[PDB]
Design a protein around this ligand. Structure first.
Ligand code: HEC
Ligand SMILES: [Zn+2]
Ligand SMILES: [Zn+2]
Ligand SMILES: [Zn+2]
Ligand SMILES: [Zn+2]
Length: 118
């Protein structure tokens, strides 16, 4: 629904991830560096080095939104790619102002890169 682009030509997310390209993910992360670092520093968003498997809303000292704090669970690869599909829909009232990664391979490639940034 709606009059914007919605097709995907590269389409089971686990299958997409298993063949992902971490160097391509390293470039997708450029879209997140204004807010997120991979050296443990926190800023507009919390650091994302070691996010894969981390408790949701877990970074010490970072002031998360109410729906993020109340969510529970961990950032598994499925959780991460669901949230990155369209943050504002997937966690209504998130404070992350990012439109999303509609390309399924961009999500899988970005998750594969974050897996190597623990
Ligand atoms: C303009 C800022 C901005 C951009 C760009 C941004 N985030 Fe975020 N991000 C935030 C904020 C703010 C939060 C905290 C959201 C909340 O508390 O609801 C967050 C939370 C996250 C979380 C939850 C972390 C946790 O510790 O619970 C993940 C995962 C995340 N961003 C991933 C990404 C990725 C991957 C990108 C790039 C594709 C990205 N973000 C781009 C601002 C950004
Ligand atoms: Zn950490
Ligand atoms: Zn701690
Ligand atoms: Zn509140
Ligand atoms: Zn949820």
């Amino acid at each position: 629904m709606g009059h914007g682009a919605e097709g995907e030509e590269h389409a089971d997310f686990a299958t997409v991830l298993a063949s992902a390209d971490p160097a391509a993910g390293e470039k997708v992360f450029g879209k997140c560096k204004a807010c997120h670092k991979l050296d443990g520093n926190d800023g507009v968003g919390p650091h994302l080095n070691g996010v894969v498997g981390r408790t949701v809303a877990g970074v010490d000292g970072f002031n998360y939104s109410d729906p993020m704090k109340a969510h529970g669970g961990d950032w598994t690869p499925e959780a991460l790619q669901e949230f990155l599909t369209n943050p504002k829909a997937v966690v209504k009232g998130t404070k992350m102002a990012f439109a999303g990664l509609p390309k399924i391979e961009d999500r899988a490639n970005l998750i594969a890169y974050l897996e190597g940034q623990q």
